[PDB]
């Protein structure tokens, strides 16, 4: 088989980066998110030939679109649903095949994150450009006007940015010195600012306890951050227990998930109404909404606190990404697994009903 | 025996809903968020009776993007189901419903019409007042602010003003009064409010251009709006990236703009979809225009249409009813036949498993003919 480097799940689709700089995609294709030129669903992983030879180094999905970028090509590509300018091409057009974001050509890209209808990019210098829907200030540009092209977040002048993340309509960031910012839609307290108001510019979280943050990720209406100590924090919406605090209450400021204090967190991912966190010792913990089985624990009970996601022969997990109603994961033996809702083909195991525990994707896996 | 006849059809993002004689509600298409109301999450590619409403005396059904509402004149009850986020369901919580539940706030209220957009709804009472609930981030509820409402609330701006009907797009709303004034509010960035600018309104504001011409009806697509004047002239405004305003170009209009190509005809019904438009003439002729990628304009191809083209039906039967979804269209004829066209991946076409269809196809389960 071929070695899987990067995985990303969208609301209803999944995307992978293989060695060879090869992109493949599967799931719902109705909005063009798969990049294949047609609008049909794919129930099994499908190579995105248009990107062969472009030296893609990364891929990330928003809700109904996909972004990818190349270091050597110094290029960023986007395809999928076009409304609100989320693709960054200066028009609203849908794209059924990848296109370069001209604004981003030749810029040193450190990371891209995609939300429902907006994206951001962080440069090596630690600058942030954003584009797409901005009705609730989620671009962080001081206004409520949508932007069809990338614009610089001037509020970060003099503040170097490590990482950013994007939920449905809010955005979060961590600075190089470990500060946490949030802006955009905040009605569920998901900005971490201790209230339920929007921000049109980045605003600092001043409620850590002194804890500096190394990473951040968003689900739909909740946020997750990790400290330099490997401690996990969550905030925002907890109707479905996706904050994982053993209960169902909203948190307006970052809240440490003690249940996981005995481990060091390497990776985090937020989905629609659930959450995933991967420890340094290769154990995967999921929580939240489990109607479609997306938590992966072999049942369909919601989980208000972290619960270990089991794999065959206890193989260690090296990566995870949450869609809206599914989850994806890579293991040390280079197998790729998926679980949850399967109606759009997003599991990538061909024809399938929903799966409440992890299932191997033979096309990407060594094993069967 | 005789089929039941469709009394009412409505189309949502990717599902279809009908009311049949006998007060029977059925639905088909996408089921993932519970919009079908059968208590499960699977798509139905064929019409399926919503058993839970059997015996409830439903007189009308209306779809939003991924939700559905119905009501009962005699029982004086309004029911809703599907995606619950932002309170679009009206139950005072944000929980999804895979099965119809009564909107307790509307119990005992005489209901004249329901309109559903993406994540908001509005109801007009027989007395011609208007209540609304759901997402309100752009003031689409007309309540004065931008905070979502989990329960219906009365639009206070309409006191002293009787409402005939209302309409709702993705995040905007329009209404016409019992004497023909036209209003708009909510998300206004593409001019779809018809007020001459690209700014939201948090309360109903009267359209003053086309003010001289009165309006009998209004309908909304995603980001565009359609109205019919008392002389039967068709006006459109808002987004026309896909030619959905139908003016033979792709320009936006920030105020009502008359569609000349149809000046000769008298328009009796209108419908707005995701990126397409439908208009039914007084003599039973159906015209469609706009985005046609999945064949939803219904004119036998997949090329976009910036001007109105007549949709053709077997025997040139007359059409009496039409509803636009995002990527499909439904219509009822004078002969009691029901046709669907466009995208059918989620089963929204109602014709069993099928490829997409770019001209009308009869729905056998709800039709006289075949």
Q: What is the largest CA-CA distance in chain B?
A: 55
Q: Which of A31, A37, A83 is the mutation pick for testing B, counting most B CBs within 10 A?
A: A83
Structure tokens at A257: 């998930």
> Is-contact B48 B26, C-beta < 8 A?
yes
- Residue B294 and residue A135: Cβ atoms within 8 Å? no
Nearest to B142 by CA among B125, B111, B166: B166
Going A179 to A183 to A188 to A193, the CA torsion angle's sign is: positive
Measured at the CA of B342, the angle between CA B339 and CA B344, to 5 degrees, comes to: 95
Structural domains in chain B, sorted by start: 1-370 (2.130.10.30)
Overall residue count recorded for chain A in this entry? 368
Overall residue count recorded for chain B in this entry? 370
C-alpha separations of B334 from B9, B320, B321, B322 in Å: 14, 6, 9, 12
- B303 three-class SS: coil
> Is-contact B198 B188, C-beta < 8 A?
yes
Across the interface, of B137, B148, B241, the residue whose CB is closest to A136 is B137
Neighbours of B2 (CB within 10 A): 7
Displacement of CA A340 from its chain's centroid (Å): 17
Q: In angstroms, rounded to a whole number, what is the distance separating the alpha carbons of residues B273 and B276?
A: 5
- Residue A292 and residue B42: Cβ atoms within 8 Å? no
Residue B310's H or E segment, with its range, is strand B305-311
- Residue A41 and residue B138: Cβ atoms within 8 Å? no
- Residue B32 and residue A341: Cβ atoms within 8 Å? yes
Experimental method: X-ray
Tokens 């036998």 sit at which residue? B300
- SS3 string, B249-301, reads CCCCEEEEEECHHHCCCCEEEEEECCCEEEEEECCCCEEEEECCCCCCCCCCC
Q: In angstroms, rounded to a whole number, what is the distance separating the alpha carbons of residues B225 and A162?
A: 44
Close Cβ partners of A110 (under 8 Å, ≥ 6 residues apart): A121, A122, A123, A124, A126
Nearest to A285 by CA among A239, A234, A333, A237: A234
Across the interface, of A135, A146, A239, the residue whose CB is closest to B137 is A135
> Is-contact A294 A274, C-beta < 8 A?
yes
List the beta bridge partners of residue A279. Answer: A265
Q: Which of A34, A39, A346 is the mutation pick for testing B, counting most B CBs within 10 A?
A: A39
Q: In angstroms, rounded to a whole number, what is the distance separating the alpha carbons of residues A342 and A324?
A: 11
Q: Which of A32, A63, A84, A92 is the mutation pick for testing B, counting most B CBs within 10 A?
A: A92
Nearest to B238 by CA among B201, B194, B289, B202: B194
Q: In angstroms, rounded to a whole number, what is the distance separating the alpha carbons of residues A364 and A296?
A: 19
Measure in Å the smallest separation between the Cα of A187 and chain B Cα atoms.
9
C-alpha separations of B211 from A271, B43, B181, B214, B229 in Å: 48, 45, 7, 7, 10
> Is-contact B221 B324, C-beta < 8 A?
yes
Tokens 């949450």 sit at which residue? A322
Structure tokens at B206: 């009267």
Nearest to A142 by CA among A131, A153, A129, A156: A153
Q: In angstroms, rounded to a whole number, what is the distance separating the alpha carbons of residues B132 and B77?
A: 16
Close Cβ partners of B59 (under 8 Å, ≥ 6 residues apart): B7, B19, B23, B71, B72, B73, B74
Residues of B in contact with A291 (CB under 8 A): 41
Residue of B nearest to A136 (CA): B137
Residues of A in contact with B294 (CB under 8 A): 39
Residues of B in contact with A187 (CB under 8 A): 147-148
Tokens 């083209």 sit at which residue? B309
Q: In angstroms, rounded to a whole number, what is the distance separating the alpha carbons of residues B120 and B136?
A: 8
For chains A and B, count residue pairs whose Cβ atoms are closer than 8 Å: 25
> Is-contact B194 B237, C-beta < 8 A?
yes
Chain B contacts to A (CB-CB under 8 A): 32, 41-43, 94, 137-138, 147-148, 187, 189, 241, 293-294, 327, 343, 345
> Is-contact B247 B304, C-beta < 8 A?
no
Q: In angstroms, rounded to a whole number, what is the distance separating the alpha carbons of residues B151 and B141?
A: 11
- Residue B137 and residue A185: Cβ atoms within 8 Å? yes
List the beta bridge partners of residue A95. Answer: A80
> Is-contact A11 A328, C-beta < 8 A?
no
DSSP per-residue string spanning B26-94:
EEEE--TTSTT-SSS---EEEEEE-GGGTTS---EEEEETTEEEEEETTTTEEEEEE--GGGTT-SSS-
- Residue B43 and residue A185: Cβ atoms within 8 Å? no
Q: Which residues of B215-252 are buried (b: 16+ CB within 10 A; e: fewer)?
A: bbbbbbbbbbbbbbbeeebbbbbbbbbbbbbbbeeeeb
Tokens 């896996």 sit at which residue? A365
- A258 three-class SS: helix
Quick one: chain B helix, strand, coil %, rounded to 5? 5, 45, 50
Tokens 């209803």 sit at which residue? A12
Close Cβ partners of A142 (under 8 Å, ≥ 6 residues apart): A155, A200, A201
Resolution number, Å:
2.0
Nearest to A222 by CA among A319, A289, A141, A311: A289
- Residue A239 and residue B94: Cβ atoms within 8 Å? yes
- Residue B293 and residue A146: Cβ atoms within 8 Å? no
Q: In angstroms, rounded to a whole number, what is the distance separating the alpha carbons of residues A166 and A119?
A: 7
Residues of B in contact with A188 (CB under 8 A): none
- A23 three-class SS: strand
Q: In angstroms, rounded to a whole number, what is the distance separating the alpha carbons of residues B342 and B65?
A: 16
- Residue A40 and residue B293: Cβ atoms within 8 Å? no
Close Cβ partners of B160 (under 8 Å, ≥ 6 residues apart): none
- A236 three-class SS: strand
Tokens 């420890």 sit at which residue? A279
> Is-contact A221 A188, C-beta < 8 A?
yes
DSSP per-residue string spanning A157-199:
TT--EEEEEE-SSEEEEEETTS-EEEEE--TTSTT-SSSS--E
Measure in Å the smallest separation between the Cα of A354 and chain B Cα atoms.
11
C-alpha separations of B298 from B41, B351, B357 in Å: 29, 16, 8
Measure in Å the smallest separation between the Cα of B156 and chain A Cα atoms.
25
> Is-contact B335 B26, C-beta < 8 A?
no
Q: In angstroms, rounded to a whole number, what is the distance separating the alpha carbons of residues A177 and A221?
A: 26
Going B321 to B348 to B328 to B170, the CA torsion angle's sign is: positive
> Is-contact A112 A69, C-beta < 8 A?
yes
Q: In angstroms, rounded to a whole number, what is the distance separating the alpha carbons of residues B339 and B350?
A: 9
Residues of B in contact with A136 (CB under 8 A): 137
Q: In angstroms, rounded to a whole number, what is the distance separating the alpha carbons of residues B206 and B124?
A: 18
> Is-contact A321 A277, C-beta < 8 A?
no
Torsion from C-alpha of A323, A329, A330, A335, nearest 10 degrees: -110
Nearest to A64 by CA among A26, A85, A34: A34
Eight-class DSSP state of B2: P
Q: Which of B15, B32, B170, B222 is the mutation pick for testing A, counting most A CBs within 10 A?
A: B32
Q: In angstroms, rounded to a whole number, what is the distance separating the alpha carbons of residues A79 and A86?
A: 9
Close Cβ partners of B299 (under 8 Å, ≥ 6 residues apart): B288, B292, B305, B309, B310, B311, B312, B358, B359
Structure tokens at B215: 């309006």
Using CB atoms within 10 A of its CB, is residue B183 exposed (0-12), middle (13-18) or buried (19+)?
A: buried
Measure in Å the smallest separation between the Cα of A39 and chain B Cα atoms.
9
Q: In angstroms, rounded to a whole number, what is the distance separating the alpha carbons of residues A221 and A202?
A: 17
Residues of B in contact with A30 (CB under 8 A): 327, 343, 345
Close Cβ partners of B287 (under 8 Å, ≥ 6 residues apart): B262, B265, B278, B279, B280, B281, B308, B309, B310, B311
């Amino acid at each position: 088989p071929r070695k899987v480097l990067i995985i990303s799940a969208g609301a209803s689709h999944s995307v992978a980066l293989l060695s060879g700089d090869i992109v493949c995609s599967w799931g719902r294709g109705e909005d063009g998110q798969l990049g294949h030129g047609d609008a049909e669903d794919r129930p099994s992983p499908t190579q995105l030939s248009a990107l062969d030879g472009h030296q893609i180094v990364s891929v990330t999905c928003g809700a109904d679109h996909t972004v990818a970028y190349s270091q050597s090509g110094m290029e960023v590509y986007s395809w999928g649903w076009g409304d609100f300018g989320r693709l960054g091409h200066g028009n609203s057009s849908d794209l059924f095949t990848p296109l370069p974001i001209k604004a981003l050509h030749g810029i040193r890209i450190k990371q891209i994150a995609c939300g429902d209808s907006h994206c951001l990019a962080v440069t090596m210098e630690g600058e942030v450009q954003s584009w797409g829907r901005n009705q609730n200030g989620q671009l962080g540009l001081g206004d409520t006007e949508d932007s069809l092209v990338p614009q610089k977040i001037q509020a970060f002048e003099g503040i170097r940015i490590k990482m950013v993340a994007a939920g449905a309509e809010h955005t979060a960031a961590v600075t190089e010195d470990g500060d946490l910012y949030g802006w955009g839609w905040g009605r569920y307290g998901n900005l971490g600012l201790g209230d339920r108001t929007d921000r049109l510019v980045p605003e600092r979280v001043t409620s850590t306890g002194g804890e500096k943050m190394s990473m951040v990720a968003c689900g739909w209406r909740h946020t997750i951050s990790v400290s330099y100590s490997g401690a996990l924090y969550t905030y925002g919406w907890s109707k479905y227990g996706q904050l994982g605090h053993g209960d169902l209450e909203d948190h307006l400021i970052p809240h440490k998930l003690e249940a996981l204090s005995n481990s060091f967190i390497s990776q985090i991912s937020g989905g629609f109404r659930h959450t995933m966190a991967l420890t340094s010792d290769g154990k995967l913990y999921g929580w939240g909404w489990n109607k479609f089985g997306q938590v992966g624990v072999g049942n369909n009970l919601d989980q208000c606190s972290p619960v270990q996601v089991r794999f065959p022969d206890d193989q260690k997990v090296v990566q995870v990404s949450c869609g809206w109603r599914h989850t994806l994961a890579v293991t040390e033996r280079n197998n790729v697994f998926a679980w949850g809702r399967g109606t759009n083909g997003q599991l990538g195991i061909g024809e399938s009903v929903d799966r409440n525990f992890p299932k191997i994707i033979e096309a990407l896996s060594v094993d069967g």
